[PDB]
Amino acid sequence: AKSRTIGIIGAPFSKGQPRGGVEEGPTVLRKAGLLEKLKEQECDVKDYGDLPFADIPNDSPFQIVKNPRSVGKASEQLAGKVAEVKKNGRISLVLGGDHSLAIGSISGHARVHPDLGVIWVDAHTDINTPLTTTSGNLHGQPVSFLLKELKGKIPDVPGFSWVTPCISAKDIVYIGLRDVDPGEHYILKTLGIKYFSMTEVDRLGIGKVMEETLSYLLGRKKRPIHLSFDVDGLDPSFTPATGTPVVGGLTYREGLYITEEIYKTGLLSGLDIMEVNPSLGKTPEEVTRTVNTAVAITLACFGLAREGNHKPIDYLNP
Amino acid sequence: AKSRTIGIIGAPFSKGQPRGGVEEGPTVLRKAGLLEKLKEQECDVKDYGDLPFADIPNDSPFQIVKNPRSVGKASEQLAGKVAEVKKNGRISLVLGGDHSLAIGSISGHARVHPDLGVIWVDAHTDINTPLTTTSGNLHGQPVSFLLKELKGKIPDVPGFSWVTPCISAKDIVYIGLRDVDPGEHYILKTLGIKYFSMTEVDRLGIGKVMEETLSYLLGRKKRPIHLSFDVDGLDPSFTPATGTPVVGGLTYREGLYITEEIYKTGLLSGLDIMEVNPSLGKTPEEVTRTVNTAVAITLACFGLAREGNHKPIDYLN
Amino acid sequence: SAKSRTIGIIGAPFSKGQPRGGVEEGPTVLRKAGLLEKLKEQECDVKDYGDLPFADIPNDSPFQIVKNPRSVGKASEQLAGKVAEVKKNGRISLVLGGDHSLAIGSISGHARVHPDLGVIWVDAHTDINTPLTTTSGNLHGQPVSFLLKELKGKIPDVPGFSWVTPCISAKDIVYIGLRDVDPGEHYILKTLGIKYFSMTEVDRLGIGKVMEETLSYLLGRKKRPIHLSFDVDGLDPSFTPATGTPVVGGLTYREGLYITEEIYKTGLLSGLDIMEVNPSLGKTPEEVTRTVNTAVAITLACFGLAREGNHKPIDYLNP
Ligand SMILES: O=C(O)[C@H]1NCCC[C@H]1CCC[B-](O)(O)O
Ligand SMILES: O=C(O)[C@H]1NCCC[C@H]1CCC[B-](O)(O)O
Ligand SMILES: O=C(O)[C@H]1NCCC[C@H]1CCC[B-](O)(O)O
Ligand SMILES: [Mn+2]
Numbered sequence A: 001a002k003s004r005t006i007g008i009i010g011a012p013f014s015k016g017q018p019r020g021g022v023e024e025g026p027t028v029l030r031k032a033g034l035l036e037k038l039k040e041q042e043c044d045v046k047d048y049g050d051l052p053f054a055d056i057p058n059d060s061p062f063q064i065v066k067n068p069r070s071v072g073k074a075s076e077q078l079a080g081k082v083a084e085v086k087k088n089g090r091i092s093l094v095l096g097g098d099h100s101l102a103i104g105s106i107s108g109h110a111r112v113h114p115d116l117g118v119i120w121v122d123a124h125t126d127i128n129t130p131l132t133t134t135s136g137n138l139h140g141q142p143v144s145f146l147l148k149e150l151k152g153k154i155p156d157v158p159g160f161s162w163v164t165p166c167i168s169a170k171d172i173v174y175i176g177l178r179d180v181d182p183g184e185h186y187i188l189k190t191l192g193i194k195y196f197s198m199t200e201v202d203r204l205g206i207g208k209v210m211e212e213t214l215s216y217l218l219g220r221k222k223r224p225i226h227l228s229f230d231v232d233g234l235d236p237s238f239t240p241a242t243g244t245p246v247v248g249g250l251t252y253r254e255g256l257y258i259t260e261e262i263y264k265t266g267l268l269s270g271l272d273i274m275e276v277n278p279s280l281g282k283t284p285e286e287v288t289r290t291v292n293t294a295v296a297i298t299l300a301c302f303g304l305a306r307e308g309n310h311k312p313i314d315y316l317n318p
Numbered sequence B: 001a002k003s004r005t006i007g008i009i010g011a012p013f014s015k016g017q018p019r020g021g022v023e024e025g026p027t028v029l030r031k032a033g034l035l036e037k038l039k040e041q042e043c044d045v046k047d048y049g050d051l052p053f054a055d056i057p058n059d060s061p062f063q064i065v066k067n068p069r070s071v072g073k074a075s076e077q078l079a080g081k082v083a084e085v086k087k088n089g090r091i092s093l094v095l096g097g098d099h100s101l102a103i104g105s106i107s108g109h110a111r112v113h114p115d116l117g118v119i120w121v122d123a124h125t126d127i128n129t130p131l132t133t134t135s136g137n138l139h140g141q142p143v144s145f146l147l148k149e150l151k152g153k154i155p156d157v158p159g160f161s162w163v164t165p166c167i168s169a170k171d172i173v174y175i176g177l178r179d180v181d182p183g184e185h186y187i188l189k190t191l192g193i194k195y196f197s198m199t200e201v202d203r204l205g206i207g208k209v210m211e212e213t214l215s216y217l218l219g220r221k222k223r224p225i226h227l228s229f230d231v232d233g234l235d236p237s238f239t240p241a242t243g244t245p246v247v248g249g250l251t252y253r254e255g256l257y258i259t260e261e262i263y264k265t266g267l268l269s270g271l272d273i274m275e276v277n278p279s280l281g282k283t284p285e286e287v288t289r290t291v292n293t294a295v296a297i298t299l300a301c302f303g304l305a306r307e308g309n310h311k312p313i314d315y316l317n
Numbered sequence C: 001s002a003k004s005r006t007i008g009i010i011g012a013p014f015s016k017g018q019p020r021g022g023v024e025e026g027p028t029v030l031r032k033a034g035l036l037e038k039l040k041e042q043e044c045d046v047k048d049y050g051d052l053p054f055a056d057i058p059n060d061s062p063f064q065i066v067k068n069p070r071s072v073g074k075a076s077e078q079l080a081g082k083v084a085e086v087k088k089n090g091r092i093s094l095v096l097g098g099d100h101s102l103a104i105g106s107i108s109g110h111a112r113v114h115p116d117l118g119v120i121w122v123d124a125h126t127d128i129n130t131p132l133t134t135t136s137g138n139l140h141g142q143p144v145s146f147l148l149k150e151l152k153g154k155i156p157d158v159p160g161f162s163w164v165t166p167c168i169s170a171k172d173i174v175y176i177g178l179r180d181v182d183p184g185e186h187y188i189l190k191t192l193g194i195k196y197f198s199m200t201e202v203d204r205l206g207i208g209k210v211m212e213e214t215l216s217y218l219l220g221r222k223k224r225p226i227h228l229s230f231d232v233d234g235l236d237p238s239f240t241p242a243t244g245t246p247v248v249g250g251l252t253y254r255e256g257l258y259i260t261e262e263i264y265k266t267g268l269l270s271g272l273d274i275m276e277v278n279p280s281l282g283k284t285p286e287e288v289t290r291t292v293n294t295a296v297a298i299t300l301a302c303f304g305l306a307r308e309g310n311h312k313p314i315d316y317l318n319p
């Protein structure tokens, strides 16, 4: 099935944020047996390896924005690699790496499927512009570079001349929000972007959140779905090994429910698994809990159902 | 009240599965004050004791299926004891022990009340047949022995010729599923069995799960209910001391909700509290947490309500 | 600042309503955590009214089995006057406890200025034992019985409580979070027909529906002042372990924030009580900080802090 035909891309990149270690995300996700577990559930999996992001040593900040050329070039290469995977009729699976990479992942995916809709699972909106940001970390700005409605508000940052906004504000849905800066809240509300913060998830329940999310993105017409999954969208009791953890998050059950429902549309076309940092647990078990949770979420996007799965054969007459 | 008139049956049996310690389930449940706590809650408790499961020498496997004679005999004895409790007008409360004992518990309950409905709370369907199983552990097969529709698909397994399938596929509702084998999922779907996996619980909420579960089993008219509760249906953060824990389970609150709703029907007729294994708690606190949760679940089955309880007297005069 | 974010802080370091020492350090640890400064960061107009000085009463004989009756009654008497004064200044009273016996004073004082108020009681417990139905004798499990007009006749004359005049009827109080109710309390709750949402109702409906029904019940006819009395033991002990009577199976951190965010949105919050935080009952220092941080998060959510974000009325893209 095309919903189980996958193209794996390793994106060992950390310069979109200050905490070292997130570049090992692809390594620890592979070592948990991701590819093998995907093959076990009938997927046709091709591994495109890890991108060799060459060093960009002269990389002065753009105002307070750190490592602009390195973040820009990593997303530039990733966009080219994602477009290649999409051209091969495979769902792109990007193993991160920090979430600044979503600029490239979504941009490359859009080059092949410009009609795509985005589901962004995260505790954060990642919609600060290079002028509204206070940290200067590019992993908290990817959505700003991608929105067409923000054209005019994104300055000329070195390394990003290749970026052309590819998604309208109406074609993205946030799920999991609980730590939004004032400037980000002003943008979210002014643009009228569809969102389900932890307050909406608490009000409606995840069942209704997904029914509304899929109706919002697929109601006018069926189109490719890009899911950008930041592991910090889940509560730190399931994904502690991440750089910006926030209490009161999505449960392990809610994360599986989101991805099971996205699988069943048959429209998943691109997936990002972002912000796994195996240098940031309090214990080695906290790292293993985080990686196992990310693998579990990944398997659900490609058909693993909690009710069970079976091949089309008579199990009572083998 | 008949909804609080109970017959306790200890079933210290572990040979339906490979991890030692589940035979201590009745001991640690009694040690935690279960019978005394039920009496304090206005229950009429009769203790039928702990079943003596005599060892069977040379219990050779049936193909890959382990301890068939032992499992079959323990369920045979349990069926006879449960039928005895039901004839005395009591709700049978089986303290397990591994889940293979549900063959005996449901069979004995059906000998007295053939029209019963089964609510099966578990991370697992336990519906592998002696032929579809890959572990050979009989605690993962009890539902296959009881189902009328699988008659002709279960081979002649030594120790089980006394079993007469007593439940139709329409008469069972699963709640809690999240770890189902391919063969098991094939059976669940081809039989059309009603189930609320963790996916349905997330989608609907436990309130709707119970409303649909009870409307499905009781729609037509009142009928006895058998609740078979594997403690692994709850998330391992509440019941860690169990052999097959699966994360993303029912919460402690959801477990109390299901049992409080079943109590309110006034139709609870048979109860199994299964898979408590005090040798699998990583700390003595993990053991106590599991035992405390299993006790809380059982008390809710016989009337303990979170909103409060009171006798029909005036507390202000 | 908006009326919804115009606050009067009252510290109530009182512990004689229950037997465990340390709940008197509740107002200190909440302030030490940066509470008042965090409220100012949220556009709040905060005026601190200080910690009430509670005098020692060494000749405080028990009323039958009821412990420290004069000390508890006088503590609540001092608080009713201080709450009524904050209400007269057009501010939302924010009472930092201290044990829940203080709710007699907080609600009594609030009712002196706004007698039409409605109460939302977030707790694992009903706290509706009367001095005759109580088995422990601890007044922190009896405040609601002293406040109800329907119980005028069943409450004996307890020393230190003559000033109390019941101000709320059974129709004016909604409980949320109930999971440990004595038999006498359950009899009172069901005979008075009080609206409640125990953990069973929260599981059945979800916190979304619990709040929609709660607010429709209390506000639906006419808009009125809300008094939120919040016992931290309402939330599960995985979030608020540093408390005297923890009960498992509680409200989550998310449900706590959902209740308070929804109450803020009404724009009618008039009085608030953050009760039973006992920093001496933490098994580890981590459990104490967790309970304090959670109490702080619930408090900020009552005054505008929203999980979806907050922003000033300025253009952030061209300021
Ligand atoms: O701009 C920023 O640095 C901050 N803005 C507010 C939320 C926290 C953070 C960025 C978080 C990035 B993320 O989601 O990819 O982990
Ligand atoms: O057949 C088996 O042994 C297995 N089948 C798939 C689920 C895990 C296990 C059986 C679990 C038994 B139970 O639910 O009683 O704990
Ligand atoms: O009356 C009592 O002392 C008891 N009655 C039963 C519940 C526990 C307790 C009172 C606890 C008071 B509270 O909510 O303020 O912590
Ligand atoms: Mn992110």
Ligand SMILES: [Mn+2]
Binding pocket: A122, A123, A124, A230, A232, A233, A244, A275
């Ligand atoms: Mn994030």
Ligand SMILES: [Mn+2]
Binding pocket: B122, B123, B124, B230, B232, B233, B244, B275
């Ligand atoms: Mn099980």
Ligand SMILES: [Mn+2]
Binding pocket: B099, B122, B124, B126, B139, B230
């Ligand atoms: Mn089982």
Ligand SMILES: [Mn+2]
Binding pocket: C100, C123, C125, C127, C140, C231
């Ligand atoms: Mn209280």
Ligand SMILES: [Mn+2]
Binding pocket: C123, C124, C125, C231, C233, C234, C245, C276
């Ligand atoms: Mn309480």
